[PDB]
Amino acid sequence: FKCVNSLKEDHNQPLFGVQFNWHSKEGDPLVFATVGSNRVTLYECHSQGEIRLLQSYVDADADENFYTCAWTYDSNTSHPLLAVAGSRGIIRIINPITMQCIKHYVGHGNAINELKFHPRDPNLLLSVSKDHALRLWNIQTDTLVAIFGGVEGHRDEVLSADYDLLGEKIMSCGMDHSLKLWRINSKRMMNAIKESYDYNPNKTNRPFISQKIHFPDFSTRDIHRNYVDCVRWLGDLILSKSCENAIVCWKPGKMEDDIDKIKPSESNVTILGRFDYSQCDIWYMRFSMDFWQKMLALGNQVGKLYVWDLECTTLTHHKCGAAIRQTSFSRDSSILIAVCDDASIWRWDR
Numbered sequence: 384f385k386c387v388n389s390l391k392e393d394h395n396q397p398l399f400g401v402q403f404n405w406h407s408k409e410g411d412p413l414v415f416a417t418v419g420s421n422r423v424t425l426y427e428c429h430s431q432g433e434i435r436l437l438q439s440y441v442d443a444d445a446d447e448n449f450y451t452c453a454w455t456y457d458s459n460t461s462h463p464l465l466a467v468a469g470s471r472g473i474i475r476i477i478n479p480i481t482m483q484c485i486k487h488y489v490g491h492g493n494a495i496n497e498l499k500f501h502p503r504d505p506n507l508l509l510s511v512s513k514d515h516a517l518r519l520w521n522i523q524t525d526t527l528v529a530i531f532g533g534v535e536g537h538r539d540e541v542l543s544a545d546y547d548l549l550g551e552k553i554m555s556c557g558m559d560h561s562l563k564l565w566r567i568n569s570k571r572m573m574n575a576i577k578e579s580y581d582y583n584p585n586k587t588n589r590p591f592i593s594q595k596i597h598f599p600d601f602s603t604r605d606i607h608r609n610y611v612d613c614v615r616w617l618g619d620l621i622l623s624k625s626c627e628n629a630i631v632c633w634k635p636g637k638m639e640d641d642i643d644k645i646k647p648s649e650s651n652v653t654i655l656g657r658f659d660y661s662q663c664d665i666w667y668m669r670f671s672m673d674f675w676q677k678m679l680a681l682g683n684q685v686g687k688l689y690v691w692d693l694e695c696t697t698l699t700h701h702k703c704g705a706a707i708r709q710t711s712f713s714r715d716s717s718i719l720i721a722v723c724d725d726a727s728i729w730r731w732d733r
């Protein structure tokens with residue numbers, strides 16, 4: 384990788400999220416969204432390292448702080464859509480062609496730390512919040528499918544979550560140092576998703592009833608000893624990190640235990656490996672993988688970018704010295720974008 388460009392957003396506030404749109408066809412514009420301050424900005428990657436500003440969304444609320452964004456598409460037209468959320472706890476769905484807010488979802492009692500769309504169903508949106516819960520939304524029928532939390536859910540702010548390959552289960556993590564598994568291919572969750580598609584407020588006077596999922600299907604606090612701020616599935620394995628200068632690769636149960644045989648009472652975990660690094664010991668630093676899950680990237684608090692080949696390289700630039708909060712690879716993995724605390728964006732081309 385070589386650094387081919389860099390820019391700074393005029394708001395001068397930290398950029399907390401960056402996502403390439405992986406739903407665009409080959410030969411169609413290579414676009415990424417950045418979120419920071421009360422802004423959402425779209426950029427296009429052109430040849431010779433050129434980055435072109437496409438559109439900006441500025442929230443009507445000047446005190447909003449966006450923390451996350453995620454791309455999806457309309458299941459009937461295949462047109463792209465961008466979801467954004469942050470400190471206000473409001474999810475906004477943006478039409479990226481006009482950069483206008485189409486619709487918004489209220490409900491979390493506090494900030495939203497992460498948004499993720501279901502890998503098979505573009506209408507299923509997962510949000511994770513400082514209110515200790517995760518919420519699953521159906522953005523086609525505007526329904527809250529389920530709330531994951533309560534008694535035996537997270538006991539502190541939820542920082543990240545990820546669906547597995549097929550979206551049969553979710554792993555979440557947060558300030559309580561725990562990682563919890565929530566199966567969404569249970570008869571109860573499949574029926575709730577099915578019912579969310581049949582719901583229409585114009586044909587009934589009764590509200591849609593969301594499932595209250597009080598119990599996870601697995602839980603561990605034995606991987607990290609501090610806030611767990613990023614979790615991702617790697618097949619049936621998990622990659623997760625805290626502020627302890629390592630990404631840990633682990634699995635629930637013993638070495639030969641199949642993930643789908645793991646009971647909620649499972650007391651063991653198996654550590655499979657560690658990706659060690661330096662100077663990334665502050666809260667709120669995300670790692671990311673490319674589409675094919677063959678590369679792993681993580682920025683550190685002094686503007687160094689670590690890249691591992693999953694099949695370590697340190698990327699540095701003399702002008703890049705601020706914390707890199709999140710990175711995103713283009714779908715073909717030829718471009719890696721890094722966003723920083725000083726509102727700077729760095730483009731690295733392979």
Ligand SMILES: CS(=O)(=O)c1ccc(-c2cnc(NCc3cccc4c3CCO4)n3cnnc23)cc1
Pocket residue numbers: 397399400450451494495496497542543612613666667668669708709724
């Ligand atoms: C520069 S400062 O003023 O010291 C500062 C630093 C961090 C935050 C902050 C960032 N991000 C989130 N949530 C998203 C999130 C969650 C997990 C991992 C992760 C991210 C974004 C990158 O990595 N926050 C929720 N509450 N505060 C924050 C706010 C101010």
